[PDB]
Request: fold
Amino acid sequence: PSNIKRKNKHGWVRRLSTPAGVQVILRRMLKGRKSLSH
Amino acid sequence: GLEEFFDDPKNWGQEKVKSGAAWTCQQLRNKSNEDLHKLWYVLLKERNMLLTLEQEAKRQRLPMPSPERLDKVVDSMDALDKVVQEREDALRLLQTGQERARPGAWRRDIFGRIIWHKFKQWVIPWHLNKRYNRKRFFALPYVDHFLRLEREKRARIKARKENLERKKAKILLKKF
Amino acid sequence: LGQIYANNDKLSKRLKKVWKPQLFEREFYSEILDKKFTVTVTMRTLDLIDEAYGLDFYILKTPKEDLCSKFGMDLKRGMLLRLARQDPQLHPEDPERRAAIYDKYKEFAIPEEEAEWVGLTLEEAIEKQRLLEEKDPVPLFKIYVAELIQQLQQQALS
Amino acid sequence: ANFVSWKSRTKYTITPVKMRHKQRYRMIDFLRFRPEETKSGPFEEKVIQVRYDPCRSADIALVAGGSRKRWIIATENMQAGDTILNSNHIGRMAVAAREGDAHPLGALPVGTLINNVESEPGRGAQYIRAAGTCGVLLRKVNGTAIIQLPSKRQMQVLETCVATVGRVSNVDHNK
Amino acid sequence: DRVYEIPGLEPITFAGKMHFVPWLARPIFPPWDRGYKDPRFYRSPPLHEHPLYKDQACYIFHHRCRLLEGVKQALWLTKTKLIEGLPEKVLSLVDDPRNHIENQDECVLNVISHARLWQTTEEIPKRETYCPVIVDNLIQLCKSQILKHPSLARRICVQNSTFSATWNRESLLLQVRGSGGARLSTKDPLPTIASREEIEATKNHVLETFYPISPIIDLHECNIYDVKNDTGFQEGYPYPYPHTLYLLDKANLRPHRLQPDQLRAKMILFAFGSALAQARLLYGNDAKVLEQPVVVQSVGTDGRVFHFLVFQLNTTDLDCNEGVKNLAWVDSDQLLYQHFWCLPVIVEPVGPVGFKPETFRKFLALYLHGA
Amino acid sequence: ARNVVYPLYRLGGPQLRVFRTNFFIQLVRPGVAQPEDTVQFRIPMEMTRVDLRNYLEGIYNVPVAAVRTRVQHGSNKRRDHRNVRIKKPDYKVAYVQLAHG
RNA sequence: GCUAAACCUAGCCCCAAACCCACUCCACCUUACUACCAAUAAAGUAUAGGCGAUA
RNA sequence: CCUCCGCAUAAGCCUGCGUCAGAUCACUGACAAUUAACAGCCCAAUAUCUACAAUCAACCAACAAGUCAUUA
RNA sequence: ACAUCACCUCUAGCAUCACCAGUAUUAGAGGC
RNA sequence: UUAAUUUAUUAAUGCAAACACCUGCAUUAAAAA
Reply:
């Protein structure tokens, strides 16, 4: 377990870095997840 | 000194301390900016005392002597803030015509939703601001499908709500 | 971007094909804008050039869907603005040639307001409009001063 | 991926460079004849140290000329304190060159062993560069020399391309 | 964007918005200049409008510059004769047994053992830790002689002293910027060592010059320079005459350390610079032969290997390649002990081995000069 | 003041002044033995050490000699009927050593 | 007689109609929630099709 | 009577045997706490300097050829 | 075991993103 | 892989176009279905 690693791969910045990650966040926002990212 | 954090020693352990009405907004509108200033600090001291007492009562496992006056002080300070804020915005509307103190804009973030972006203070202008220019205030065409699906989700929630209201009205008319 | 059959027989496989044009880096002269433009074109572009008798006539004649080029519409907008403005900056200290060229394209003379919005993508038009109606909010001080002056005028006439 | 190449230094430097057993990289100057700033024509250079280099098979020489040191690649008998002439003038006759100096191929006795051969005038020395290697100047025509590479494939280069004479150092790297 | 090419129309950009937009043209922004001066974000002017930018490039020898061949560059750069070995005068200061500390050898041995073994909590003191301490302790041992020679009350050992000195050789402009520790200052100047006959015999000498590398190599090219001779103190300062420059090579790593030849060149140039600053302060900026040549000595150390220099500066007309020349006496590779064992090896006990007290005797002689 | 934007300072600019401070304070009884000159406060998260010093000195005329601060972590180990964690808020504790003995 | 059983109403579904949402203050693309720098019908008709499955 | 364990830091975890009160081989509610010197959190530019391993670094002993610096 | 030193086999006469800032006593592709 | 037929491509050629790159039309192989 590592916080640096976790925030590097699944974090908000990494998600928004690409259109695929933006789509992940959009999917999770449509579903209503409390946690959209790490 | 530090005695102002506690009320008069004659009231310690009295279990009921008498207090008067809280300031209304209308009453505070007739006072000067300086009277509002000093009254603010008077209320600041009073609230600090009451918070100190509340915490100490929690610590001693005893009920607070009179918790209503804390609410009254809080309401008084909210009224004072409202009065001063009204004066500030009236003056701003007069001199500048602006309705809000903080500049902002209607922007459209990466997820395609309209937001009110509030501006920040910077030293360098925006075109050489490395961090600011990383933000995306536009949506690419892959968002519009998700925008449509969110719209449909909202529509579903509204339809359910309106239908449920109508069913409840039918039940009410049935009983009565 | 299409598909074909392997040997022009439908009993063969279906395989993907792309048909690309032949691009020529040619160089033209817009007389009305008075500029040498290097442009990537096609042989067909040269043919409509020949039939239209000039880059100018070709640009102000060919409609948007037939031009299918944003650069073509930038050229169109510039040309139509230069006509509408009667702009003396085409050929300074040379009025007879300016008048000759400007009369040569009297047909495509348009109002300047109409020429301003020609060839604009929708987002570009919204950006122009939002500049246009962006005004600093007029302070309520002068509104109220004018109202008070007006009320005093009304009371004076009473 | 996050691959940024270490090959990122711009200026020529005499110092080793941390590159990505661990090794540091000594920048070699293969443009053997380069006149320095506000100098031209041939120029002498001095060998300060003949140094082992991890990045390659041959060993190298720290060689200082005028106001600049530089790493060049060593020939077989090159000592510390040796003096080497980097020449440009194509002589009318051949030049009876010593073991380690660099001349345009027009200025060599034909049938001598050369190394660090260019491909264009101003290209830099691309070939005959590994340990103990050598190539013999076979014959030359008008503005043209023909080389025998150690793979015995002959090469037609211009006359005014600089090559160094002698064979490359660190012999018996093979054995 | 091709809209920038059309002579008529102005491109529509995202400058109205305060953000980038992929479907609008990129605006052209004016070069922004911050109105006020803020130290943390200062950009210096490019190297032309500095108030002192001289076309004639100057060459600076600072505390870092490691010479190529070494000593030869120092003699050439200074036009100085090099005589191996200190003169009879200095060595005769310790010729007698009376000019000696009580339990001299043992005392020096104890200083060594302190520096190398008994210094810190760390088992093996490192070079930065034991080099300056060896130096300072040796000066303290030497200063223990104030009983015999009271004149030693008129000298001080000042640190963080920087001097500068400018001189021309042929067409090359040279400037030395000495920034080194442990400079010893005396109220009284050092008497001349070289008498008339040796300096008048140095004329026949020709300084040997080398090739192909220019005798300017590895010195700092510097175009933003000031031709200012700085002796390192304000005027009217007591103890104004330099006596001995103590320079130490205290880098742990071998590459980071000066070679002994390079260190000797270091001290030659530093002593020359000190003497030249003194000469210019006492005689003005005139290139002449001094009737009162200035003598300044230096002690260079690696931590255990010592070197001694005595410099006699007698000419200020450096530009010429003939005439009288300065002269320096050198003692080189004067190691004060061969090795030091911090752990017993199993055979050889902890301590120094190869301790030779003549090196410290020379140290003491140099210290007692002018006393 | 809390929950406000602060005007940005630039070199040679006017002193930042707060006219109606927004953060409020309580002095709480220490949970452990403390020196005689130490007074313990519970303080808002945004309020700094300099802010607390100036606050006491100005509003309450208390001569302050030293201030120390720590952030106390509230417990997240307690749950609803829905197995959802309930947070006790974190808070700031200030230790004020009074001046002039 | 223990365990247990039983309960109606939260809400939801399908339609109709009508085109929806989105700045208390503050914070949030950097490690997010971080004050601040380079119809119907025609009709399964005509037609297409390893002329067949089918279309 | 065991001790092949322990004590700190790092990483990770996040109040998870402190006090008061209650229920439950014989957790819940409330209150309280970790105080910087340790450690994070750095650096004004423009050029321009950075050939010689470590191993007690002195020999020896080598190869796989090395972990280190400024000036105006 | 693979890798990797080392060894064997085959290919390659050459330059700026690997090979390579290398040049057939070399490099790459394999195998152990 | 020397099943089916094909070369979408990639590497080459040959021929058209243009005054080598780019394009269109055929052929030969590797890697491919």
The radius of gyration of chain F is 17 Å. Chain F touches chain B at residues 5, 7-8, 10, 19-21, 24-29, 39, 42, 59-62 (CB under 8 Å).
